[PDB]
Design a protein around this ligand. Structure first.
Ligand SMILES: *[C@@H]1O[C@H](CO)[C@@H](O[C@@H]2O[C@H](CO)[C@@H](O)[C@H](O)[C@H]2NC(C)=O)[C@H](O)[C@H]1NC(C)=O
Ligand SMILES: *[C@@H]1O[C@H](CO)[C@@H](O[C@@H]2O[C@H](CO)[C@@H](O)[C@H](O)[C@H]2NC(C)=O)[C@H](O)[C@H]1NC(C)=O
Ligand SMILES: *[C@@H]1O[C@H](CO)[C@@H](O[C@@H]2O[C@H](CO)[C@@H](O)[C@H](O)[C@H]2NC(C)=O)[C@H](O)[C@H]1NC(C)=O
Ligand SMILES: *[C@@H]1O[C@H](CO)[C@@H](O[C@@H]2O[C@H](CO)[C@@H](O)[C@H](O)[C@H]2NC(C)=O)[C@H](O)[C@H]1NC(C)=O
Ligand SMILES: *[C@@H]1O[C@H](CO)[C@@H](O[C@@H]2O[C@H](CO)[C@@H](O)[C@H](O)[C@H]2NC(C)=O)[C@H](O)[C@H]1NC(C)=O
Ligand SMILES: *[C@@H]1O[C@H](CO)[C@@H](O)[C@H](O)[C@H]1NC(C)=O
Ligand SMILES: *[C@@H]1O[C@H](CO)[C@@H](O)[C@H](O)[C@H]1NC(C)=O
Lengths: 50, 106, 50, 170
């Protein structure tokens, strides 16, 4: 994927690896090396009007 | 179109994605029965209400506005004359006051 | 079975009228939608993401 | 096919979207019938003596002889209009819609326009017609003097309406 990785405030349970949002898209992931939770905010999207 | 009843005015209020109209309307209430006639027969002439309606409370005849009870004396100023008494169905006999009559009388 | 309304037999006769002797100043509400949510959809990002 | 339904589950909420849109249309039709016909909260009834100063409303008032309680014009109108799919019945049946029209007819005949703006105030039908004549800028005397002619013209026009509906397919 492509997204901004930020530190997460979510309390993942031990089994849980990746997290889904309101709309069931992958919004959080657990790093396989250091067991920390990271939010994946998508890269900024804008409508360019002239 | 602008509320239940006879419409007086309306007030707009902004609402999320919408408008709320406060319709101020006039609703008649406390109605009362009266005996009514289409015309008044006086001096062989038929009198019809200019803007109101003829009502009777049992013994006396009056002319009143249609949407509120305000009995007034049947005169030549609130009635108009068209034809005699032989044509109108349901015409009743009653006097019609003349405002000019006390003036030349005195 | 749904009730259409209360029965009200109007006392019609050929020589009787009903004249109001009073009035009620009634204020009623009428709610009308005017606009919707203005939505713009990025066709490429919705169908394909990144 | 159970397997087809299992494969259909992969497509998501298309079925829910179509059912919800159809349900919205179905409730909208009942709302339309309520908005058109259910504009009075009182079911008015005509007096048993159908004399209105020469005006004849037999073709529009409900017929007691008919089980459907419809008018002759309404009876003519009803006669002249003829794998997962279902037709839901309307919330208001034909007899209740006819009852609503009967209440509206009784209100407009016995009370004029008073019942639409508040309580139904009785008024003789010639006097109501005279009020309507004043509305279009014609004096009351014209209505009262020519009351028999106006009643005859109205009855003739109502009869012509029934004949015209019965004689025209389109
Ligand atoms: C109909 O209304 C008229 C006027 O409001 C009544 O006439 C008056 O009645 C009172 C009560 O007896 C008398 O004191 C007045 O002198 C009357 N005025 C006139 C000009 O006669 C009349 O009585 C009412 N009739 C009924 C049956 O209620
Ligand atoms: C209203 O008054 C007129 C005249 O004052 C009445 O007409 C008379 O009625 C009598 C009896 O019916 C006849 O004998 C006369 O020939 C009529 N005269 C005229 C000029 O028509 C009339 O009957 C009265 N109506 C009411 C309801 O009292
Ligand atoms: C006007 O008079 C009529 C009767 O002449 C009244 O109608 C009656 O009202 C009572 C009470 O609601 C009913 O029990 C009767 O069945 C009605 N009779 C008829 C023939 O409809 C009417 O209420 C009166 N109007 C006012 C405003 O008092
Ligand atoms: C017309 O109706 C109004 C109410 O809409 C009456 O006003 C009430 O009068 C009583 C006593 O007369 C008071 O106790 C109430 O507080 C009044 N209400 C309001 C809102 O002011 C009024 O009296 C009626 N008038 C007639 C002539 O019937
Ligand atoms: C009102 O109109 C109806 C029909 O529109 C009249 O009924 C007719 O009456 C005559 C004489 O009794 C019969 O020969 C016809 O066959 C009737 N027609 C129908 C369709 O029934 C009725 O007489 C009129 N007047 C009243 C007071 O109801
Ligand atoms: C190696 O991965 C394990 C879990 O898979 C983790 O606990 C450990 O810290 C990792 N070691 C290093 C040096 O990254
Ligand atoms: C009104 O009706 C009564 C009885 O129903 C009748 O005696 C009277 O003559 C009628 N009046 C008119 C003007 O038709």
């Amino acid at each position: 994927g492509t997204g901004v990785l930020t530190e997460s405030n979510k309390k993942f349970l031990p089994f849980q690896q990746f997290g889904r949002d309101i709309a069931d898209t992958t919004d959080a992931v657990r790093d396989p090396q250091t067991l920390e939770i990271l939010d994946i905010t998508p890269c900024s999207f804008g409508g360019v009007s002239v | 179109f602008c509320g239940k009843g006879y419409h007086l005015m309306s007030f707009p209020q902004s609402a999320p994605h919408g408008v709320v109209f406060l319709h101020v309307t006039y609703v008649p209430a406390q109605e009362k029965n009266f005996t009514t006639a289409p015309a008044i027969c006086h001096d062989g002439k038929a009198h019809f209400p200019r803007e109101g309606v003829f009502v009777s409370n049992g013994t006396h005849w009056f002319v009143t506005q249609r949407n509120f009870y305000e009995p007034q004396i049947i005169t030549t100023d609130n009635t108009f004359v068209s034809g005699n008494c032989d044509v109108v169905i349901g015409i009743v006999n009653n006097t019609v006051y003349d405002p000019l009559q006390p003036e030349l009388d005195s | 079975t749904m009730s259409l309304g209360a029965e009200n037999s109007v006392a019609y006769s050929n020589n009787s009228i009903a004249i109001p002797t009073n009035f009620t100043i009634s204020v009623t509400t009428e709610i009308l939608p005017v606009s919707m949510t203005k939505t713009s959809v990025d066709c490429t990002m919705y169908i394909c993401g990144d | 096919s159970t397997e087809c339904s299992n494969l259909l589950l992969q497509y998501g909420s298309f079925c829910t979207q179509l059912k919800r849109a159809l349900t919205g249309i179905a409730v909208e039709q009942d709302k339309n019938t309520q908005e058109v016909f259910a504009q009075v909260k009182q079911i008015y009834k005509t007096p048993p003596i159908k004399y209105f100063g020469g005006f004849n409303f037999s073709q529009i008032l409900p017929d007691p002889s008919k089980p459907s309680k419809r008018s002759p014009i309404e009876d003519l109108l009803f006669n002249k209009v003829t794998k997962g799919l279902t037709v839901l019945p309307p919330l208001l049946t034909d007899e209740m819609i006819a009852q609503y029209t009967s209440a509206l007819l009784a209100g407009t005949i016995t009370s004029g326009w008073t019942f639409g703006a508040g309580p139904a105030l009785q008024i003789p039908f010639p006097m109501q017609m005279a009020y309507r004549f004043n509305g279009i800028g014609v004096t009351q005397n014209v209505l009262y003097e020519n009351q028999k002619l106006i009643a005859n013209q109205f009855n003739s026009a109502i009869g012509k309406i029934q004949d015209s509906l019965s004689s025209t397919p389109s």
